[PDB]
Amino acid sequence: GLFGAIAGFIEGGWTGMIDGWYGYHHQNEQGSGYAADQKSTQNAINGITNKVNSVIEKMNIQFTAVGKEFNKLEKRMENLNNKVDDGFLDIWTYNAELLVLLENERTLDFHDSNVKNLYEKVKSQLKNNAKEIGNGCFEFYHKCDNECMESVRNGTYDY
Amino acid sequence: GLFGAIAGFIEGGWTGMIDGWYGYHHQNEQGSGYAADQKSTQNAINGITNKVNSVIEKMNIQFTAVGKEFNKLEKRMENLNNKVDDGFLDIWTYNAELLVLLENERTLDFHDSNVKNLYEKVKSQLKNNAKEIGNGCFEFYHKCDNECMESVRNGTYDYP
Amino acid sequence: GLFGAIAGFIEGGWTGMIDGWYGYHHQNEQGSGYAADQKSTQNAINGITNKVNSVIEKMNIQFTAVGKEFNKLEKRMENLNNKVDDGFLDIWTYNAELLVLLENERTLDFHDSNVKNLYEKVKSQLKNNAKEIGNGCFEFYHKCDNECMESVRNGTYDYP
Amino acid sequence: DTICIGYHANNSTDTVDTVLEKNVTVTHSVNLLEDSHNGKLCRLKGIAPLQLGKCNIAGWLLGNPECDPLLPVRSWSYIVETPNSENGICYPGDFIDYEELREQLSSVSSFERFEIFPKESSWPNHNTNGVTAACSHEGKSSFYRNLLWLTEKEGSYPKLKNSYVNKKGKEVLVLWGIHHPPNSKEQQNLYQNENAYVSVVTSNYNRRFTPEIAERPKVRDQAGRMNYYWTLLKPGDTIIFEANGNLIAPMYAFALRRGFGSGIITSNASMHECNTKCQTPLGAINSSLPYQNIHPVTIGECPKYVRSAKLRMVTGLRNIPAR
Amino acid sequence: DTICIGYHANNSTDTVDTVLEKNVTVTHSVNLLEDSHNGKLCRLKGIAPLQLGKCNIAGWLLGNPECDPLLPVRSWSYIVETPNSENGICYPGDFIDYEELREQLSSVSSFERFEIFPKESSWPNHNTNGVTAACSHEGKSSFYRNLLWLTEKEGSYPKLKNSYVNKKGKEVLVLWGIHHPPNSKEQQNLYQNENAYVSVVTSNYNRRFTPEIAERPKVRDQAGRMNYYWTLLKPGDTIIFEANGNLIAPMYAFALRRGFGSGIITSNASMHECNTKCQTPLGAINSSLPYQNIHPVTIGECPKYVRSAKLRMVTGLRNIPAR
Amino acid sequence: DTICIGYHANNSTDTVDTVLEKNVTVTHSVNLLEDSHNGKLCRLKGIAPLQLGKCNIAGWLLGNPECDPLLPVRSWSYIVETPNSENGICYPGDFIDYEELREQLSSVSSFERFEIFPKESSWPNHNTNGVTAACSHEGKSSFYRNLLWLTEKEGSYPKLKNSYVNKKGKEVLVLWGIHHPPNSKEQQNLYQNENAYVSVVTSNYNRRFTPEIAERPKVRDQAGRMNYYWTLLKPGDTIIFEANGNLIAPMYAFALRRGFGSGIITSNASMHECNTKCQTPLGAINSSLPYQNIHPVTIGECPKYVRSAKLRMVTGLRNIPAR
Ligand SMILES: CC(=O)N[C@@H]1[C@@H](O)[C@H](O)[C@@H](CO)O[C@H]1O
Ligand SMILES: CC(=O)N[C@@H]1[C@@H](O)[C@H](O)[C@@H](CO)O[C@H]1O
Ligand SMILES: CC(=O)N[C@@H]1[C@@H](O)[C@H](O)[C@@H](CO)O[C@H]1O
Ligand SMILES: CC(=O)N[C@@H]1[C@@H](O)[C@H](O)[C@@H](CO)O[C@H]1O
């Protein structure tokens, strides 16, 4: 990835998490589990929903377009009409494929970035109260519970 | 933002800084005050100036273009001319709008990246002489008057 | 650069390294030298090679295209044909130049990113068995032979 | 105690292409390319198409006896021709500005077929029962339903002059023909005058027709030829027909009503009682996707045609089940 | 002692759209879409346009009496027709290849209107005072200023043959007409010769015209018709007119000079003493912006027309005053 | 002990442009714009083009004596005309639908020139030695190789009628002419009948021609004129010629074979024994790049033409020797 998180210092994903695209794991004390970070997932959802809607919106509806007939003495006109239809078709086919290719790359980097920023956000919150270990995981020192785990999720961790 | 600085760990902008896009804010015993980092601000300006100019340059000037008339027995030709004009217009409108949307996103990520890299540059200087407050600031372990603050602005400092 | 490494905290390139785009230097006791990271380098090659082939693939071949004659009473038709040809030429010229400009930028940032991640990747390994000096460089503490300098290249080191 | 930061994963097999890599499996994605359609020709916003079937526009407008089933149709949403639409003109000849007439009918939403020159009363001094095996029906010689073959009556073809004032409040499509005998003898017994002519005029149309006699290869067993012409008579205007021979006079004309979105397509698909907002020669499309690779010819409101086989945008992320 | 790294912010309310988020407030931005014009028609680089006013190209070149004010204009930067440009041909008829003539005039930067066939001395054996109420002027029957109506003199219309050699060193546009009476009586007392004809030839042009006599709906109170024709006479070439009736002879012709960047536009805007490099039918544009959404029709060097309502590029950063 | 992370650098001076910066020196890159050609006209996949040279399509198909070297050519990959292709029609006149004939020849891969009407046996009762200084050869008056000038034989011009049945199994291009004397005396001396006509008909073609006699400026030292016509005779159909004067009859016709990828180009480059898949008027191209700025006219499989002077895609990274 462009930001090094996904398929990076965080080797794989969690089929266990099903609430959003990004989230936390947490465990020990009262038990384990998964929890999606709504803040990040929603922002990401709004952004990507906008991207897709923009792509769609930019392509106005194609109104009636049909063939035309030319008599035997209008070959040049027939070929001109042909040059026009094929020319526009080439351009739109090119445009559509390139836009999708280019934006798909951008979307993936966007997610990579989101995971990365989320990781760094929790890190600057925990500081010395925990140690970076299992790539994406922080092992607490003061040992926190569940209400405390939530303060880490909603970003209010009282250092 | 993609790089997490703007509207990120550096939560807001300074309406108090008016010398550039990126800068510092010192708060020592001698006083406070803002100061734009010319190095970064200028590079950002050159890049964005070249970007805007490129967009403009690629759209060479439109020379005389007008309608044409067709007699009542040239309906197919009139429609061909119409298909041609609408077709090119659809493409250029799409092109112009898409290019602006895509590049505006890129410009914002650009600035974000500039603030991020600037922060990391200073962080690597104040490595072991101050502590990261967390939101773009650094508290020096010792004094830093004003002449010391400048050593930080011009990328020198040197005192690990 | 967008990611701060190339022409950033790692000032320049190594004309000495010729095995790949990204690599390590290493100046251990058994001697020194250069070594390129096959992993990242090869990975970058596959991406860029795919990019170039995509750009080329999308621009399928131009088949026979030639001028046309019009008699003296077909000026409108001749001008229509002219509008069509110039319009398609304007668009393709625009498309080609923009795509290349836009993707060249992306390519440079791609490399910047690869160097950046390779760096942080080694850093997260050494952790405390060395410090960060001239940026891009790490001064080992325990002193490791040309055998251990290798454990870093292949990413196994281990000794936080 | 531990807390890890991670990302979603699933069993999705969706794949997408990027600039740097092809076939990347992702958690969520959306397809933007429509590739599904009805067969089936449907009504367009409730209105049925005009199916010429074995007939083409010429056969329909002139009244080729093989196109009678089309005589009552007054309105349609689009016109459909088939690969077997071979019944056009039945008497050999040239249909002047035929492609332009087709283009005209393409923006016609409906019309009223009416007698512009009633067979009985319009031509008192001429015979009008002229028929031909070239336009046979039920195994018998017949003729166009909208035209009348005028010929000599009791050894004489008086100079005729008939006019019609357009009081329909719409453009009236008028069609007629000029017959060309293969030899002067035939020209004589059919129209009596050897140097005949036909004149047709309106406030904005002015044309004269002269018989061009010559032996010709047979077409549909006829050495003769019939050239067909048409004009659009503006509301309130008058059309005057004058001739002393060779005129295949108009009997029925059409009061046209203009509309938008119509067109002529060629399809071998069948008409069904379905409704759609987008119709192609292959079938109807019901979609909101921006693109389609079904067919470049479309009637209505449709996705833009592209030659692409696949256009999928990733929304989720790189799927890594970590299994 | 603290030092912080931050970014600029202000009170700008400029907004822009991005792929991921719409209406994003930024510190600095640049508009690339021109939406301003001065609702006036201006000179194009000092040269004034030709305003046909109530006349159209046809009325201008033929010499419609209602277009006399246009007679002296020799050069222009562009041609302007208005919604009320109704004065074209005043005697009813068909202007052959009219659209092509318009396209030819579109690359004409200036011309000299000269007498190709002086009224007094060109037609010694024919009358040249024929006029019509269809082309009246000052409530009195008149005729085109650039053409002459030739008719019988003293009971006879002698075969005429007159020619002109182009020594202007430029293409010369020649126009003429062919009159078509509604009946033989009129054909006879105007031209005497019942079966007349007109011939016009050059080294690269060759056409013959025959009167087509027939009763026609009256237009501008005339049952007659006049078809107008034109050709371009190359430098050094000769044009020959030969006729024994029905010829509406050329009196004035035009020696054309070609240029680039001109065209015909339709506008209801008024001419003012202003200068511009870019003119549209709505007004003149003075801008360096790449796009404009003002009008698709343009003359000169203009921004590219697009249907966009807004095209603003952001240069500054996301604006967060944080108040 | 120190270990550093760094990136490649070199001597390369390659530069590329990006959106933010211009002329970025990079380590590696690839050019995508083909700007090289071999300056020669080549065979296209082994087949040689047809070089009309000093002749143009008209001169070639009619058989202008100045184009005899072309008579034997039967196949070609593309047609080449030169800035000096001035030898077309030699007898002044108009070549009807000439541009369309050229378009027709653009998709012909080969044909067989054959005698449709053998000079002797086709016209027993007419003189066929008609010749003109306008079409001279070897400083001696001659005539088109593919046509025959028929004239009065012994003060008599019998009404002729000849037919040809197409049994070639391919389209047959038939060409002919109509001569137009400048005066009645000549018409009489050459064709006897004062009021002559020519009729040409097939199953889908039907045209009649009438001599139009008038004094005209001399072109190529002739006041007379010859108008040239053509038509495509479908496999199995029959073409009939009927006349009593003025016919410039067909002697040789062409059985056409259709192909794809051909076209007519104009070039001043020379033919060489080279082979290519892509030919431009300036020279052939041998390349796999997607674009070329050599020329917009192409034959075969070529790169896309663009007006760009440079299109280089960086592959390596920003080059910084750090010297
Ligand atoms: C000790 C040493 O030489 N390092 C290698 C290392 O380069 C390689 O990646 C790893 C797995 O094959 O095996 C180690 O032995
Ligand atoms: C003079 C004027 O137009 N007023 C604006 C003011 O509204 C704005 O708050 C300030 C800072 O952006 O800039 C001023 O120029
Ligand atoms: C005209 C010329 O010599 N070419 C250079 C060109 O290589 C460079 O891209 C451009 C931008 O600095 O400046 C031009 O002067
Ligand atoms: C790359 C190379 O070897 N050059 C040849 C070139 O000499 C030849 O004219 C052309 C025709 O096929 O093919 C190229 O591959």
Tab-separated table of N, CA and C in Angstrom, chain D residues 71-128:
chain	number	residue	atom	x	y	z
D	71	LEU	N	-51.936	0.148	-42.382
D	71	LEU	CA	-52.839	1.252	-42.714
D	71	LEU	C	-53.560	1.961	-41.561
D	72	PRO	N	-54.012	1.212	-40.544
D	72	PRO	CA	-54.717	1.842	-39.418
D	72	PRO	C	-53.870	2.478	-38.312
D	73	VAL	N	-52.595	2.112	-38.221
D	73	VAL	CA	-51.728	2.656	-37.176
D	73	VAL	C	-51.576	4.172	-37.284
D	74	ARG	N	-51.883	4.878	-36.199
D	74	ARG	CA	-51.809	6.336	-36.192
D	74	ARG	C	-50.724	6.964	-35.319
D	75	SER	N	-50.224	6.231	-34.332
D	75	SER	CA	-49.190	6.770	-33.457
D	75	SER	C	-48.242	5.677	-32.989
D	76	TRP	N	-47.037	6.078	-32.603
D	76	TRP	CA	-46.018	5.129	-32.169
D	76	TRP	C	-44.914	5.866	-31.413
D	77	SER	N	-44.093	5.116	-30.691
D	77	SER	CA	-42.996	5.682	-29.909
D	77	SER	C	-41.650	5.585	-30.636
D	78	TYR	N	-41.570	4.675	-31.603
D	78	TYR	CA	-40.374	4.481	-32.417
D	78	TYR	C	-40.731	3.518	-33.536
D	79	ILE	N	-39.945	3.535	-34.605
D	79	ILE	CA	-40.209	2.677	-35.749
D	79	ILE	C	-39.223	1.525	-35.799
D	80	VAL	N	-39.731	0.340	-36.119
D	80	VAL	CA	-38.899	-0.850	-36.180
D	80	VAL	C	-38.922	-1.528	-37.540
D	81	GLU	N	-37.745	-1.689	-38.127
D	81	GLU	CA	-37.628	-2.386	-39.392
D	81	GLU	C	-36.913	-3.681	-39.048
D	82	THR	N	-37.092	-4.699	-39.873
D	82	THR	CA	-36.460	-5.982	-39.625
D	82	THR	C	-35.505	-6.310	-40.759
D	83	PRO	N	-34.689	-7.356	-40.586
D	83	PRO	CA	-33.752	-7.739	-41.643
D	83	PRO	C	-34.546	-8.168	-42.881
D	84	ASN	N	-35.811	-8.528	-42.673
D	84	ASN	CA	-36.677	-8.961	-43.767
D	84	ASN	C	-37.621	-7.877	-44.301
D	85	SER	N	-37.354	-6.619	-43.960
D	85	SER	CA	-38.181	-5.516	-44.441
D	85	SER	C	-37.793	-5.252	-45.892
D	86	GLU	N	-38.257	-6.109	-46.798
D	86	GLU	CA	-37.936	-5.979	-48.217
D	86	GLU	C	-39.028	-5.353	-49.087
D	87	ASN	N	-40.268	-5.337	-48.603
D	87	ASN	CA	-41.363	-4.763	-49.379
D	87	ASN	C	-41.427	-3.236	-49.334
D	88	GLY	N	-40.771	-2.600	-50.299
D	88	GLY	CA	-40.780	-1.149	-50.382
D	88	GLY	C	-41.615	-0.790	-51.588
D	89	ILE	N	-40.994	-0.188	-52.596
D	89	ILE	CA	-41.723	0.146	-53.811
D	89	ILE	C	-41.916	-1.190	-54.520
D	90	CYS	N	-43.046	-1.382	-55.193
D	90	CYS	CA	-43.267	-2.634	-55.914
D	90	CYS	C	-43.113	-2.421	-57.424
D	91	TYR	N	-43.351	-1.202	-57.888
D	91	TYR	CA	-43.161	-0.908	-59.300
D	91	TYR	C	-41.741	-0.324	-59.357
D	92	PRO	N	-40.848	-0.932	-60.154
D	92	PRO	CA	-39.457	-0.475	-60.276
D	92	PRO	C	-39.277	1.023	-60.552
D	93	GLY	N	-38.250	1.608	-59.941
D	93	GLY	CA	-37.981	3.020	-60.131
D	93	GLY	C	-37.106	3.585	-59.025
D	94	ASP	N	-37.045	4.909	-58.939
D	94	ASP	CA	-36.238	5.583	-57.930
D	94	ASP	C	-37.140	6.387	-56.986
D	95	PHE	N	-36.871	6.301	-55.691
D	95	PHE	CA	-37.640	7.050	-54.696
D	95	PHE	C	-36.734	8.234	-54.366
D	96	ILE	N	-37.050	9.407	-54.916
D	96	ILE	CA	-36.221	10.589	-54.708
D	96	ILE	C	-36.235	11.122	-53.281
D	97	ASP	N	-35.031	11.368	-52.764
D	97	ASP	CA	-34.802	11.865	-51.408
D	97	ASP	C	-35.428	10.956	-50.353
D	98	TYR	N	-35.336	9.656	-50.609
D	98	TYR	CA	-35.875	8.651	-49.710
D	98	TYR	C	-35.246	8.679	-48.317
D	99	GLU	N	-33.925	8.834	-48.238
D	99	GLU	CA	-33.276	8.856	-46.932
D	99	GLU	C	-33.732	10.067	-46.116
D	100	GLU	N	-33.928	11.200	-46.783
D	100	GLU	CA	-34.396	12.408	-46.108
D	100	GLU	C	-35.838	12.213	-45.621
D	101	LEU	N	-36.640	11.472	-46.381
D	101	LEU	CA	-38.015	11.226	-45.972
D	101	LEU	C	-37.985	10.346	-44.722
D	102	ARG	N	-37.078	9.370	-44.704
D	102	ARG	CA	-36.944	8.497	-43.541
D	102	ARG	C	-36.555	9.353	-42.342
D	103	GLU	N	-35.631	10.282	-42.554
D	103	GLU	CA	-35.195	11.144	-41.471
D	103	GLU	C	-36.374	11.970	-40.953
D	104	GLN	N	-37.243	12.413	-41.861
D	104	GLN	CA	-38.413	13.195	-41.476
D	104	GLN	C	-39.360	12.374	-40.591
D	105	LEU	N	-39.726	11.181	-41.047
D	105	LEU	CA	-40.627	10.332	-40.283
D	105	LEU	C	-40.074	9.967	-38.909
D	106	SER	N	-38.772	10.174	-38.714
D	106	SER	CA	-38.116	9.858	-37.449
D	106	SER	C	-38.471	10.802	-36.293
D	107	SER	N	-39.048	11.959	-36.607
D	107	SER	CA	-39.433	12.903	-35.571
D	107	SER	C	-40.942	13.087	-35.604
D	108	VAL	N	-41.627	12.117	-36.206
D	108	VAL	CA	-43.077	12.137	-36.288
D	108	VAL	C	-43.584	11.192	-35.198
D	109	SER	N	-44.446	11.697	-34.322
D	109	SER	CA	-44.986	10.880	-33.237
D	109	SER	C	-46.324	10.252	-33.628
D	110	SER	N	-47.019	10.879	-34.570
D	110	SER	CA	-48.300	10.368	-35.044
D	110	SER	C	-48.770	11.152	-36.258
D	111	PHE	N	-49.696	10.576	-37.010
D	111	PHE	CA	-50.254	11.277	-38.157
D	111	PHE	C	-51.649	10.780	-38.470
D	112	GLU	N	-52.350	11.483	-39.348
D	112	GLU	CA	-53.668	11.026	-39.752
D	112	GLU	C	-53.607	10.814	-41.261
D	113	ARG	N	-53.962	9.615	-41.703
D	113	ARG	CA	-53.974	9.296	-43.124
D	113	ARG	C	-55.354	9.701	-43.624
D	114	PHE	N	-55.404	10.559	-44.641
D	114	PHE	CA	-56.681	11.020	-45.181
D	114	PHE	C	-56.674	11.147	-46.702
D	115	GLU	N	-57.857	11.064	-47.304
D	115	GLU	CA	-57.981	11.194	-48.747
D	115	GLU	C	-57.786	12.652	-49.120
D	116	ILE	N	-56.686	12.946	-49.801
D	116	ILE	CA	-56.400	14.305	-50.227
D	116	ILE	C	-57.089	14.509	-51.582
D	117	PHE	N	-57.204	13.425	-52.340
D	117	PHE	CA	-57.868	13.451	-53.637
D	117	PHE	C	-58.743	12.202	-53.772
D	118	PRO	N	-60.005	12.281	-53.314
D	118	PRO	CA	-60.927	11.142	-53.397
D	118	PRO	C	-60.976	10.518	-54.791
D	119	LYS	N	-60.751	9.209	-54.839
D	119	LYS	CA	-60.758	8.445	-56.079
D	119	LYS	C	-61.987	8.791	-56.918
D	120	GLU	N	-63.128	8.918	-56.247
D	120	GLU	CA	-64.387	9.262	-56.897
D	120	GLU	C	-64.630	10.762	-56.754
D	121	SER	N	-64.648	11.473	-57.880
D	121	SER	CA	-64.895	12.921	-57.934
D	121	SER	C	-63.688	13.780	-58.274
D	122	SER	N	-62.489	13.296	-57.979
D	122	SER	CA	-61.292	14.075	-58.269
D	122	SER	C	-60.864	13.987	-59.732
D	123	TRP	N	-61.061	12.824	-60.346
D	123	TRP	CA	-60.642	12.635	-61.731
D	123	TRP	C	-61.770	12.169	-62.656
D	124	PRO	N	-62.735	13.058	-62.932
D	124	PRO	CA	-63.895	12.794	-63.790
D	124	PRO	C	-63.562	12.362	-65.220
D	125	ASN	N	-62.558	13.000	-65.811
D	125	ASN	CA	-62.182	12.718	-67.190
D	125	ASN	C	-61.040	11.732	-67.404
D	126	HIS	N	-60.660	10.997	-66.368
D	126	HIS	CA	-59.561	10.051	-66.515
D	126	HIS	C	-59.907	8.704	-65.906
D	127	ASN	N	-59.270	7.648	-66.400
D	127	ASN	CA	-59.482	6.319	-65.842
D	127	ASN	C	-58.539	6.232	-64.647
D	128	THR	N	-58.912	5.457	-63.632
D	128	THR	CA	-58.092	5.337	-62.432
D	128	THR	C	-57.958	3.895	-61.941
